Write a protein that binds this ligand. Sequence first.
Ligand SMILES: Cc1cn([C@H]2C[C@H](OP(=O)(O)O)[C@@H](COP(=O)(O)O)O2)c(=O)[nH]c1=O
Ligand SMILES: [Ca+2]
Length: 129
Amino acid sequence: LHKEPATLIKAIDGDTVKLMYKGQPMTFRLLLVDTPEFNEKYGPEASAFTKKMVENAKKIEVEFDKGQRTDKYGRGLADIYADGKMVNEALVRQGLAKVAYVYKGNNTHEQLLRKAEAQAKKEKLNIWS
Ligand SMILES: Cc1cn([C@H]2C[C@H](OP(=O)(O)O)[C@@H](COP(=O)(O)O)O2)c(=O)[nH]c1=O
Ligand SMILES: [Ca+2]
């Protein structure tokens, strides 16, 4: 899998970010995770966590997986990195997202994310408390 360059346009919520990718604005939905909606418990924390992570980054990178690249809403589906750190993983490690929406073809980092979710669960972090 390849890391491609992109630049923050705007933080959206826990698992969606607007980025400029190949010179075009686009909404990215984070692969393999599900954060609570802003209106739900831990929703504001997950939005704040992703925000701080994408806004503090010197470098944002987008990585597509081996299946579908855009969903039925036209959102890009990707792993997002912030100065080398995967946002998808970091959210699950902190108990602010569940592993979810696992479809074959687009699950390269599945095991990694489950592994984070187990430690979060062990620590009773956030969603698991
Ligand atoms: C993460 C992800 C979501 N989706 C779609 C399925 C869901 O459809 P429905 O909207 O029909 O339920 C929706 C969930 O996104 P959200 O969690 O952002 O709402 O996005 C994909 O198709 N592939 C993906 O990899
Ligand atoms: Ca969500």
